[PDB]
Amino acid sequence: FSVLKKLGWFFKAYWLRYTIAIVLLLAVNVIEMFPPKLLGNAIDDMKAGAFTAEGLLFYIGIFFVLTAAVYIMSYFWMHQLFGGANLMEKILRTKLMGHLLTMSPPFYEKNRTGDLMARGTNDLQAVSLTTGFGILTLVDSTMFMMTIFLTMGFLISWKLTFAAIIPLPVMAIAISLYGSKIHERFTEAQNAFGALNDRVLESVSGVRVIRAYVQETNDVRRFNEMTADVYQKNMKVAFIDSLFEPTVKLLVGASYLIGLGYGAFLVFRNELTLGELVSFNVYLGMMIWPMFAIGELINVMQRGNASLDRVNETLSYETDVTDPKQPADLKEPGDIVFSHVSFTYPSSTSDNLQDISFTVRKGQTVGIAGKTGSGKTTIIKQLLRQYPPGEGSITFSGVPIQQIPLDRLRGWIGYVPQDHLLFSRTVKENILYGKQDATDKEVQQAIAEAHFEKDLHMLPSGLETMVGEKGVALSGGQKQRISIARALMANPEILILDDSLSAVDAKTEAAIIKNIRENRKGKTTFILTHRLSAVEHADLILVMDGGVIAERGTHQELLANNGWYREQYERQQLF
Amino acid sequence: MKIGKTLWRYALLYRKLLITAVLLLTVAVGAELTGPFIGKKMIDDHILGIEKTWYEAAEKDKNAVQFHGVSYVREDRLQEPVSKAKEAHIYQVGMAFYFVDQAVSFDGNRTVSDGKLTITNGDKSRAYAAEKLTKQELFQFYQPEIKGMVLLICLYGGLLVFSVFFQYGQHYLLQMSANRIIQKMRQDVFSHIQKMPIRYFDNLPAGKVVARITNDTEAIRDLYVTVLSTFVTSGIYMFGIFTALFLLDVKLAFVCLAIVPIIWLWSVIYRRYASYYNQKIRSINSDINAKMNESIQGMTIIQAFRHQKETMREFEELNESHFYFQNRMLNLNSLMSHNLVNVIRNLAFVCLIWHFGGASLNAAGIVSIGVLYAFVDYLNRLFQPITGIVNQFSKLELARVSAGRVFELLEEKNTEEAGEPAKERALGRVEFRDVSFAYQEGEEVLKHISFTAQKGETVALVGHTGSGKSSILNLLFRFYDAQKGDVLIDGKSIYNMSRQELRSHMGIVLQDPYLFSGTIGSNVSLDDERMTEEEIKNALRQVGAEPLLKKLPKGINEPVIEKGSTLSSGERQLISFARALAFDPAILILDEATAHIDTETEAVIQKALDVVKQGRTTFVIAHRLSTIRNADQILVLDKGEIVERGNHEELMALEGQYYQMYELQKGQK
Ligand SMILES: CCCCCCCC/C=C\CCCCCCCC(=O)O[C@@H](COC(=O)CCCCCCCCCCCCCCC)COP(=O)([O-])OCC[N+](C)(C)C
Ligand SMILES: CCCCCCCC/C=C\CCCCCCCC(=O)O[C@@H](COC(=O)CCCCCCCCCCCCCCC)COP(=O)([O-])OCC[N+](C)(C)C
Ligand SMILES: CCOc1ccc(-c2nc3ccc(-c4nc5ccc(N6CCN(C)CC6)cc5[nH]4)cc3[nH]2)cc1
Ligand SMILES: Nc1ncnc2c1ncn2[C@@H]1O[C@H](COP(=O)(O)OP(=O)(O)OP(=O)(O)O)[C@@H](O)[C@H]1O
Ligand SMILES: [Mg+2]
Ligand SMILES: [Mg+2]
């Protein structure tokens, strides 16, 4: 099977468990075959009055021992087989999460966050049944079928056994075709689960927008359409799933008629003994169950093949940014010099950065300004290594950025995103992301360097205030100051303030800027702002116009160069 | 019982499909059960039927077979004389048939004839005679049986072929009904979630609500397909077995009925445990989803601050708990499964042996052994159905737990009613009267808010971070109800109007823009109202987004990824601003709209606003005092209280917080 060939990696790791399970299963088969013969012997001995007192105390004891043995060994092999299915879920979930944690935005642009969740909570459930109930049914039905085939071939006859088997190949081909189609149908249906998850997420993450504009009616209708689409793709699987039972029943009933007819003909020609045919009919009656078992098996295996295929598709996404195999032993970054950097985003077609070249010397504070959609944050992202490296080069003290392990580089850089990102924890927990093993005094210092003590006094529980999901239980400026404290906690070599003063009033903005000027003295800083009062201290100011540095220099020359910088300066201060 | 009495209602809704499925299932089960009995009839009447008495009759009996010049007739194919001549039995010792033409016999005991068939049953073994029938005479004897089989096998073939459709129809209808019920459940849950207040969403992870809709509804399907099918099939099988048992015995089928209580008791013992674990499992599942959504949406920060190890450790705890509780269900599914029913079967055999073993001392049962073969066969057939249903308890309990988790959400008492959009455009008279608000009990975030906005004016809200301006916006939109005071649109209080009408009176630009999936035009238009492309383009040009369009190939048709990840924050803000301006709202509310937008585009936006702000009330919450420099009245908030108000000249003429903030914003030069 494709699913088993794909799970061979796990089956090899866990071989003793399944070996024990199979051995116990075969043993249980035999130890269950015995009770029928024992009871038959007991009843036969009860006929002529030969059943004595010893017979009772022997039959009762042997039946009790048989019951206890079957119970214990069955418990054990069901523990081993099914117990190995849960390990499927655990291992696959761990692998999936560990893969997601090392994935860059380019991966997340293509893969929706609703689809991924369905790939770790539902696909695993589909795949789990393959190694548990799937393996049990396979081996159990195979042993039962082989026992029926062998007993009919040695006890009764061979011609009859080869007679009531002709239907079986046709059943095999039919079930194989149905499984092949059900694989595609179930792959299509499973994706409709990710779409439903995404639809539910969007209607929840953006509830405020929907309710403010009164789009509830147009939101319920879209969800109803999505549910109808999901239902349609489920029926396309039902139309094939329902064919597994009728086919098996028909092609076993044909076997029954063939066997009975051939047996009657052989009896008429005097090849049978008239007691062989009754036993043969009894044996034929048993054949039905393994066929239903194999049909259910083929149905289940394909249900897990599609989900495993999706999980493997997720897990086979090579990293966009690769940690160097032979890194550089650089300890601290001295000079960040861009040289003819040309970078275009994956989904774009126009060069977002075009021939960028500037130098940031150790300790210098660099400001980047420009109209909306110019490329300011693209440089910061070039430093952060979120997307595959573009052209040109970015050398950290003469060593290209590529030949530096991501852990060290990330430790160097303290990032403040332009879009606030917070988790559902206490304020202190969020602030400690920069330095988990940090004393309360360090947190207090970081807070006081972001002009946030007054808010802490104002807040209900102070540092122990649970911020709602995404921080919805805080003001925008409070989120910004929490992010600034997070960045400043680690005391990063390079501090990236990407529009970190946007919802911070004017007094709070002045205070934070003064603190930064007195905190990053002699350290590297990238300040991105639309207000030009936060870049007055910068040694190098870069004006970005459509992916190209239109102007450069400090405040004085940019003022003396007229153009965009002087225009904005005059419109922002002389007002 | 909410869980039991509710799943019935959903089944009752689609009662036509389910009733048809049950009828098809019953017919298919009846046909399948009958089949083997047709086979048994064929056997016992056509291939084993050359064993009963062959009365010695003459010709002209409508059926007769020549044998050594004398034609005999079978017992049943014979007409109705009484004891015509004698009984000429047939017996098949070894593998060949031997004719008994001498006289009658008794209960047979096969023994080699050697010309004299010895029937050693008791003592009467006369060794009558024997004559091998060769092969041609046997075929002559069997020809009418050939006719019978050929006319009876086709009956089995017909019953088989005409019963193929019923199985497919039953299964397809069951699955269709299950899918329809899941669809209805999801739609109802989504409607209710649309009917819940914002407090519910603010302190609940988005992954815990998606789980209750999608994850917790997939697990209820099995309750209607596999469980129902298996229960119906087993019920029919056991009814057949029991009615069969009662006919051939009494006081021995009554004891067999003791199986019915035991299973019930078994279920009661299983449920009590399978419940507790299942709940936990389900709960943990939700958490995992949350952890998969919280982490994915914030992966950039997790990687930037090297929090991967802790996040994986945080995730691994939930995975380990889920795995542990699944293992705890392994023990229950192992103790109460096929095993226990096989334990009872052996116990039943032991009880039968002990009871009849104590009766075989006097050989009582052997004389009455006519009720032993049938009883043992029926007892063995009894446990095949039972093993079918006991395996359905796990699915039943999982479905019950999932249904309960869905219904506890569907039955939430807290809920806000709904109305219809506004019928008449509002003049634009917005008034706050003595409004006091507190997000958390005992903590007033706004204290005695009082002001009035007239049509054609521009009320600007200013203050330090955390003052409570966005709280004023929340109260105006009735996301959060006030606690003391009133809010009036025109002269009507906003609490006597439907929320949909109030929110239709105004269009807002939220502090943090949100972009839905689809094209930019979709976000600007939200797929409602009159989405004329020219109007959308006009709004985009008004907001100053024109460059963004000429930097994109398809313009307003450019696809927008989830959350607009491929758009700069300023571009997202411009798109949201255009969305707000495209509805031509009576009251326009801006909540720090120009926060990530440069000064050039900000000036363009202000120019666009001024042109059509002579007949539209506007609320501006801005930390950039330049945009509200020329406003009808500015209000300064401090700790949730309005301390200063008036025109800009009035505010500057009295110094104060606004004066200080404006001077700081103004060039220190
Ligand atoms: C007749 C046939 C049965 C004969 C039984 C003989 C006695 C045996 C008794 C006891 C021996 C116990 C040995 C302990 C070993 C523990 C460690 C271990 O290997 O565990 C393994 C499980 O292994 C088991 O748990 C085996 C269970 C055997 C059950 C036997 C039932 C017999 C009942 C008889 C009833 C008679 C009633 C009589 C009348 C009252 C761990 O699994 P694994 O595969 O390692 O998984 C991880 C793999 N990895 C490490 C690579 C990651
Ligand atoms: C429901 C009435 C009461 C309620 C009324 C009020 C509600 C009315 C609402 C909705 C009702 C919708 C119809 C459902 C009712 C069943 C009939 C039917 O047409 O449905 C389907 C099932 O039908 C069957 O299964 C019937 C038996 C024939 C089966 C033929 C294929 C398998 C044959 C055995 C081969 C075995 C192998 C043999 C060996 C190789 C018909 O099939 P389909 O493909 O789903 O139909 C296509 C249409 N579709 C594209 C839109 C999906
Ligand atoms: C001579 C004319 O009379 C005959 C009398 C009896 C038999 C006969 N031969 C048999 C051989 C196998 C079985 C059988 N009994 C079993 C019980 C349980 C299991 N399983 C499957 C389910 N899992 C959970 C446990 C193991 C398979 C089993 N296989 C019974 C049998 N009955 C044949 C002809
Ligand atoms: N992931 C992305 N894929 C493709 N294009 C992108 C992506 N992110 C941004 N862009 C586009 O690239 C251009 C530059 O965006 P960038 O975010 O670098 O601008 P910015 O100067 O930081 O903007 P703002 O002032 O709004 O913060 C814009 O057209 C933006 O839409
Ligand atoms: Mg930016
Ligand atoms: Mg706010």
PDB file of C-alpha atoms in Angstrom, chain A residues 32 46-47 51 63 67 71 74-75 78-79 82-83 86-87 89-90 93-94 101 103 108 112-113 121 193 196-197 202-203 205-206 208-209 211-216 218-219 223 227 230-231 234-235 238-239 241-243 249 257 260 264 268-270 272-274 277 281 371-373 386 407 410 415 418-419 421 424-425 433 436 458 460 469 472 477 481 486 503 505-507 530-531 564 568 571-573 575, chain B residues 32 43 47 51 92 94-95 135 139 142 146 149 156 167-168 171 175-176 179-180 186 190 193-194 196 198 201-202 206 210 214 218 221 289 293-294 298-300 303 305-307 316 319-320 322-323 326-327 330-331 334-335 339 343 345-346 350 357 366 369 373 416 440 443 463-466 480 503 508 514 516-517 526 528 551 562 569-570 572 579-580 592 596 598-600 623 660-662 664-667:
ATOM      1  CA  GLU A  32     -10.578 -18.719  19.617  1.00  0.00           C
ATOM      2  CA  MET A  46     -23.452 -35.493  26.237  1.00  0.00           C
ATOM      3  CA  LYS A  47     -25.355 -37.649  23.720  1.00  0.00           C
ATOM      4  CA  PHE A  51     -20.516 -37.063  30.132  1.00  0.00           C
ATOM      5  CA  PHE A  63     -13.217 -22.745  29.317  1.00  0.00           C
ATOM      6  CA  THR A  67     -11.493 -16.992  28.502  1.00  0.00           C
ATOM      7  CA  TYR A  71      -9.058 -11.606  27.367  1.00  0.00           C
ATOM      8  CA  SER A  74      -6.524  -9.365  23.279  1.00  0.00           C
ATOM      9  CA  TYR A  75      -6.208  -6.474  25.716  1.00  0.00           C
ATOM     10  CA  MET A  78      -5.245  -3.932  21.130  1.00  0.00           C
ATOM     11  CA  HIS A  79      -3.095  -1.809  23.439  1.00  0.00           C
ATOM     12  CA  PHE A  82      -4.126   1.180  18.688  1.00  0.00           C
ATOM     13  CA  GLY A  83      -1.556   2.556  21.116  1.00  0.00           C
ATOM     14  CA  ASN A  86      -1.808   7.751  18.967  1.00  0.00           C
ATOM     15  CA  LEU A  87       1.958   7.958  18.518  1.00  0.00           C
ATOM     16  CA  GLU A  89      -0.772  11.758  15.908  1.00  0.00           C
ATOM     17  CA  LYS A  90       1.825  12.890  18.442  1.00  0.00           C
ATOM     18  CA  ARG A  93       1.871  17.000  15.139  1.00  0.00           C
ATOM     19  CA  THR A  94       5.323  17.578  16.628  1.00  0.00           C
ATOM     20  CA  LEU A 101       8.284  27.261  13.519  1.00  0.00           C
ATOM     21  CA  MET A 103       9.129  28.789   8.053  1.00  0.00           C
ATOM     22  CA  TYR A 108       2.868  31.666   4.911  1.00  0.00           C
ATOM     23  CA  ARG A 112      -3.493  29.978   4.725  1.00  0.00           C
ATOM     24  CA  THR A 113      -3.601  29.751   8.513  1.00  0.00           C
ATOM     25  CA  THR A 121      -6.081  18.428  13.871  1.00  0.00           C
ATOM     26  CA  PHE A 193     -12.243  21.915   5.452  1.00  0.00           C
ATOM     27  CA  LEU A 196     -14.221  26.562   6.007  1.00  0.00           C
ATOM     28  CA  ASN A 197     -11.650  27.161   8.748  1.00  0.00           C
ATOM     29  CA  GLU A 202     -11.847  35.814   8.798  1.00  0.00           C
ATOM     30  CA  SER A 203     -15.356  36.380  10.155  1.00  0.00           C
ATOM     31  CA  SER A 205     -10.628  38.220  13.307  1.00  0.00           C
ATOM     32  CA  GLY A 206     -12.506  40.949  11.430  1.00  0.00           C
ATOM     33  CA  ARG A 208     -15.440  44.761  14.131  1.00  0.00           C
ATOM     34  CA  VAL A 209     -15.267  45.674  10.437  1.00  0.00           C
ATOM     35  CA  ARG A 211     -20.414  44.697  12.346  1.00  0.00           C
ATOM     36  CA  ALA A 212     -19.542  48.373  11.862  1.00  0.00           C
ATOM     37  CA  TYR A 213     -20.590  48.299   8.196  1.00  0.00           C
ATOM     38  CA  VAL A 214     -23.549  45.950   8.808  1.00  0.00           C
ATOM     39  CA  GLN A 215     -22.213  43.049   6.725  1.00  0.00           C
ATOM     40  CA  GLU A 216     -23.583  40.284   8.957  1.00  0.00           C
ATOM     41  CA  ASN A 218     -23.609  39.242   3.609  1.00  0.00           C
ATOM     42  CA  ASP A 219     -21.333  37.274   5.964  1.00  0.00           C
ATOM     43  CA  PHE A 223     -20.618  31.021   5.138  1.00  0.00           C
ATOM     44  CA  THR A 227     -20.939  25.026   3.850  1.00  0.00           C
ATOM     45  CA  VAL A 230     -18.242  21.515   1.593  1.00  0.00           C
ATOM     46  CA  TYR A 231     -21.372  19.357   1.539  1.00  0.00           C
ATOM     47  CA  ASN A 234     -18.602  15.278   0.730  1.00  0.00           C
ATOM     48  CA  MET A 235     -21.315  13.736  -1.447  1.00  0.00           C
ATOM     49  CA  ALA A 238     -20.284   9.237  -0.651  1.00  0.00           C
ATOM     50  CA  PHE A 239     -21.194   8.301  -4.224  1.00  0.00           C
ATOM     51  CA  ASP A 241     -17.936   5.037  -0.641  1.00  0.00           C
ATOM     52  CA  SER A 242     -21.409   3.510  -0.910  1.00  0.00           C
ATOM     53  CA  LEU A 243     -20.135   1.213  -3.695  1.00  0.00           C
ATOM     54  CA  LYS A 249     -22.094  -8.465  -1.134  1.00  0.00           C
ATOM     55  CA  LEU A 257     -24.005 -19.735  -5.840  1.00  0.00           C
ATOM     56  CA  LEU A 260     -23.291 -24.555  -4.144  1.00  0.00           C
ATOM     57  CA  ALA A 264     -24.205 -30.234  -6.171  1.00  0.00           C
ATOM     58  CA  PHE A 268     -24.310 -35.921  -8.540  1.00  0.00           C
ATOM     59  CA  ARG A 269     -21.174 -37.190 -10.290  1.00  0.00           C
ATOM     60  CA  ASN A 270     -20.171 -38.844  -6.971  1.00  0.00           C
ATOM     61  CA  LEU A 272     -18.288 -35.767  -2.621  1.00  0.00           C
ATOM     62  CA  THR A 273     -19.521 -37.694   0.412  1.00  0.00           C
ATOM     63  CA  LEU A 274     -22.663 -35.598   1.145  1.00  0.00           C
ATOM     64  CA  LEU A 277     -20.845 -30.355   1.035  1.00  0.00           C
ATOM     65  CA  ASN A 281     -21.477 -24.529   2.679  1.00  0.00           C
ATOM     66  CA  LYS A 371       6.088  58.644   1.125  1.00  0.00           C
ATOM     67  CA  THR A 372       3.886  55.594   1.553  1.00  0.00           C
ATOM     68  CA  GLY A 373       4.922  52.465  -0.313  1.00  0.00           C
ATOM     69  CA  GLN A 386      12.698  37.107   6.160  1.00  0.00           C
ATOM     70  CA  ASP A 407      20.352  32.743  15.764  1.00  0.00           C
ATOM     71  CA  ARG A 410      18.496  37.599  15.415  1.00  0.00           C
ATOM     72  CA  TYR A 415      12.857  44.480  16.048  1.00  0.00           C
ATOM     73  CA  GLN A 418       5.147  48.494  12.280  1.00  0.00           C
ATOM     74  CA  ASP A 419       2.059  46.309  12.815  1.00  0.00           C
ATOM     75  CA  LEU A 421       2.056  41.913  17.434  1.00  0.00           C
ATOM     76  CA  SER A 424      -2.693  36.776  25.173  1.00  0.00           C
ATOM     77  CA  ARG A 425      -0.517  37.092  28.272  1.00  0.00           C
ATOM     78  CA  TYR A 433      10.010  37.985  25.187  1.00  0.00           C
ATOM     79  CA  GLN A 436      13.059  35.455  29.307  1.00  0.00           C
ATOM     80  CA  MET A 458      -3.528  53.593  35.546  1.00  0.00           C
ATOM     81  CA  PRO A 460      -6.113  47.696  36.841  1.00  0.00           C
ATOM     82  CA  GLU A 469      -6.061  38.123  21.944  1.00  0.00           C
ATOM     83  CA  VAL A 472      -7.308  44.060  21.992  1.00  0.00           C
ATOM     84  CA  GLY A 477       0.069  53.534  22.072  1.00  0.00           C
ATOM     85  CA  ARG A 481       5.297  51.136  24.162  1.00  0.00           C
ATOM     86  CA  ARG A 486      10.348  44.359  24.417  1.00  0.00           C
ATOM     87  CA  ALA A 503      -0.067  56.364  18.530  1.00  0.00           C
ATOM     88  CA  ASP A 505       0.576  61.472  21.533  1.00  0.00           C
ATOM     89  CA  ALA A 506       3.218  64.233  21.302  1.00  0.00           C
ATOM     90  CA  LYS A 507       4.541  64.502  24.854  1.00  0.00           C
ATOM     91  CA  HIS A 530       6.959  59.820   8.707  1.00  0.00           C
ATOM     92  CA  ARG A 531       7.478  62.540  11.320  1.00  0.00           C
ATOM     93  CA  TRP A 564      10.698  66.206  -0.642  1.00  0.00           C
ATOM     94  CA  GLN A 568       7.736  67.737   4.475  1.00  0.00           C
ATOM     95  CA  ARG A 571       4.712  71.256   6.275  1.00  0.00           C
ATOM     96  CA  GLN A 572       5.421  69.527   9.611  1.00  0.00           C
ATOM     97  CA  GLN A 573       7.120  72.264  11.674  1.00  0.00           C
ATOM     98  CA  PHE A 575       2.363  74.669  10.370  1.00  0.00           C
TER      99      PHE A 575
ATOM    100  CA  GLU B  32     -29.477 -10.751   3.297  1.00  0.00           C
ATOM    101  CA  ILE B  43     -29.520 -28.064  -0.012  1.00  0.00           C
ATOM    102  CA  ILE B  47     -28.812 -32.460  -2.723  1.00  0.00           C
ATOM    103  CA  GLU B  51     -31.775 -39.748   1.803  1.00  0.00           C
ATOM    104  CA  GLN B  92     -24.605 -43.120   1.390  1.00  0.00           C
ATOM    105  CA  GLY B  94     -18.408 -43.844   2.584  1.00  0.00           C
ATOM    106  CA  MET B  95     -18.903 -41.854  -0.619  1.00  0.00           C
ATOM    107  CA  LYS B 135     -22.869 -43.157 -11.604  1.00  0.00           C
ATOM    108  CA  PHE B 139     -27.606 -39.144 -12.239  1.00  0.00           C
ATOM    109  CA  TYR B 142     -30.792 -36.734  -9.397  1.00  0.00           C
ATOM    110  CA  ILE B 146     -31.314 -30.680 -11.178  1.00  0.00           C
ATOM    111  CA  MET B 149     -31.954 -26.482  -8.104  1.00  0.00           C
ATOM    112  CA  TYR B 156     -31.321 -16.629  -4.869  1.00  0.00           C
ATOM    113  CA  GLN B 167     -27.715  -1.298   0.282  1.00  0.00           C
ATOM    114  CA  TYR B 168     -26.370   1.578  -1.815  1.00  0.00           C
ATOM    115  CA  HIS B 171     -25.861   4.071   2.843  1.00  0.00           C
ATOM    116  CA  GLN B 175     -24.593   9.885   4.652  1.00  0.00           C
ATOM    117  CA  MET B 176     -26.687  12.562   2.929  1.00  0.00           C
ATOM    118  CA  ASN B 179     -24.075  15.834   5.981  1.00  0.00           C
ATOM    119  CA  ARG B 180     -27.299  17.857   5.903  1.00  0.00           C
ATOM    120  CA  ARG B 186     -22.741  24.811  11.341  1.00  0.00           C
ATOM    121  CA  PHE B 190     -22.483  30.752  12.795  1.00  0.00           C
ATOM    122  CA  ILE B 193     -21.842  33.694  16.829  1.00  0.00           C
ATOM    123  CA  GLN B 194     -23.029  36.595  14.683  1.00  0.00           C
ATOM    124  CA  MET B 196     -22.990  37.430  20.311  1.00  0.00           C
ATOM    125  CA  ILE B 198     -17.909  41.801  21.339  1.00  0.00           C
ATOM    126  CA  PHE B 201     -14.665  37.801  21.014  1.00  0.00           C
ATOM    127  CA  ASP B 202     -12.195  40.015  22.875  1.00  0.00           C
ATOM    128  CA  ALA B 206     -10.024  32.822  17.509  1.00  0.00           C
ATOM    129  CA  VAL B 210     -13.315  27.791  14.898  1.00  0.00           C
ATOM    130  CA  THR B 214     -15.706  22.866  12.292  1.00  0.00           C
ATOM    131  CA  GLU B 218     -17.150  16.669  12.094  1.00  0.00           C
ATOM    132  CA  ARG B 221     -21.464  12.701  11.634  1.00  0.00           C
ATOM    133  CA  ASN B 289      -6.010  24.992  17.346  1.00  0.00           C
ATOM    134  CA  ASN B 293      -3.462  30.079  15.189  1.00  0.00           C
ATOM    135  CA  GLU B 294      -1.855  32.304  17.823  1.00  0.00           C
ATOM    136  CA  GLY B 298       2.696  35.897  15.130  1.00  0.00           C
ATOM    137  CA  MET B 299       5.494  33.760  13.727  1.00  0.00           C
ATOM    138  CA  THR B 300       7.638  36.740  12.704  1.00  0.00           C
ATOM    139  CA  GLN B 303      11.401  33.907  15.193  1.00  0.00           C
ATOM    140  CA  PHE B 305      13.061  37.087  19.385  1.00  0.00           C
ATOM    141  CA  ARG B 306      14.115  33.413  19.234  1.00  0.00           C
ATOM    142  CA  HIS B 307      11.065  32.103  21.096  1.00  0.00           C
ATOM    143  CA  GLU B 316       4.337  20.037  23.480  1.00  0.00           C
ATOM    144  CA  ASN B 319       0.184  17.460  22.669  1.00  0.00           C
ATOM    145  CA  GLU B 320       1.375  15.334  25.592  1.00  0.00           C
ATOM    146  CA  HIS B 322      -3.895  14.938  24.408  1.00  0.00           C
ATOM    147  CA  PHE B 323      -1.789  11.816  23.868  1.00  0.00           C
ATOM    148  CA  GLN B 326      -6.147   9.296  24.329  1.00  0.00           C
ATOM    149  CA  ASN B 327      -4.150   6.524  26.000  1.00  0.00           C
ATOM    150  CA  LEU B 330      -7.205   3.025  25.144  1.00  0.00           C
ATOM    151  CA  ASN B 331      -7.591   1.198  28.457  1.00  0.00           C
ATOM    152  CA  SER B 334      -9.539  -2.426  25.606  1.00  0.00           C
ATOM    153  CA  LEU B 335     -11.410  -3.601  28.702  1.00  0.00           C
ATOM    154  CA  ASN B 339     -13.071  -9.066  24.563  1.00  0.00           C
ATOM    155  CA  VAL B 343     -15.887 -13.462  27.851  1.00  0.00           C
ATOM    156  CA  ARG B 345     -20.015 -16.127  25.419  1.00  0.00           C
ATOM    157  CA  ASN B 346     -17.712 -18.576  27.196  1.00  0.00           C
ATOM    158  CA  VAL B 350     -20.192 -22.819  30.886  1.00  0.00           C
ATOM    159  CA  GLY B 357     -24.468 -31.305  32.821  1.00  0.00           C
ATOM    160  CA  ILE B 366     -30.547 -36.375  25.307  1.00  0.00           C
ATOM    161  CA  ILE B 369     -31.914 -32.932  22.607  1.00  0.00           C
ATOM    162  CA  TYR B 373     -28.466 -27.990  18.217  1.00  0.00           C
ATOM    163  CA  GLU B 416     -28.018  41.051  21.253  1.00  0.00           C
ATOM    164  CA  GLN B 440     -14.114  46.265  34.041  1.00  0.00           C
ATOM    165  CA  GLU B 443     -13.050  51.103  37.034  1.00  0.00           C
ATOM    166  CA  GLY B 463      -5.655  63.563  24.584  1.00  0.00           C
ATOM    167  CA  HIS B 464      -2.791  61.553  25.959  1.00  0.00           C
ATOM    168  CA  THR B 465      -2.449  57.847  25.250  1.00  0.00           C
ATOM    169  CA  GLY B 466      -5.021  55.789  27.117  1.00  0.00           C
ATOM    170  CA  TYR B 480     -19.992  48.218  24.450  1.00  0.00           C
ATOM    171  CA  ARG B 503     -24.203  51.432  12.672  1.00  0.00           C
ATOM    172  CA  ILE B 508     -15.794  54.356  10.519  1.00  0.00           C
ATOM    173  CA  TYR B 514      -8.307  44.979   8.626  1.00  0.00           C
ATOM    174  CA  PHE B 516     -10.299  40.665   3.934  1.00  0.00           C
ATOM    175  CA  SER B 517      -9.304  38.135   1.302  1.00  0.00           C
ATOM    176  CA  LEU B 526     -17.016  44.889   0.983  1.00  0.00           C
ATOM    177  CA  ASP B 528     -22.383  45.063  -0.896  1.00  0.00           C
ATOM    178  CA  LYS B 551       2.150  50.113  -9.267  1.00  0.00           C
ATOM    179  CA  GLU B 562      -5.111  37.136   3.977  1.00  0.00           C
ATOM    180  CA  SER B 569       0.644  49.332   6.416  1.00  0.00           C
ATOM    181  CA  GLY B 570       0.079  52.761   4.891  1.00  0.00           C
ATOM    182  CA  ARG B 572      -3.772  49.086   4.011  1.00  0.00           C
ATOM    183  CA  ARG B 579     -13.708  51.783   2.104  1.00  0.00           C
ATOM    184  CA  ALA B 580     -15.038  54.155   4.756  1.00  0.00           C
ATOM    185  CA  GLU B 592      -6.159  57.933  13.978  1.00  0.00           C
ATOM    186  CA  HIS B 596       1.049  55.215   8.862  1.00  0.00           C
ATOM    187  CA  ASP B 598       2.930  60.251   4.958  1.00  0.00           C
ATOM    188  CA  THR B 599       2.303  63.995   5.092  1.00  0.00           C
ATOM    189  CA  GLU B 600       1.832  64.427   1.327  1.00  0.00           C
ATOM    190  CA  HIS B 623      -2.584  62.486  17.521  1.00  0.00           C
ATOM    191  CA  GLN B 660       1.839  72.322  25.299  1.00  0.00           C
ATOM    192  CA  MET B 661       1.172  69.454  22.890  1.00  0.00           C
ATOM    193  CA  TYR B 662       0.822  71.773  19.891  1.00  0.00           C
ATOM    194  CA  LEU B 664       5.900  70.328  21.144  1.00  0.00           C
ATOM    195  CA  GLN B 665       4.526  69.133  17.804  1.00  0.00           C
ATOM    196  CA  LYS B 666       5.359  72.535  16.338  1.00  0.00           C
ATOM    197  CA  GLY B 667       9.008  72.972  15.456  1.00  0.00           C
TER     198      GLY B 667
END
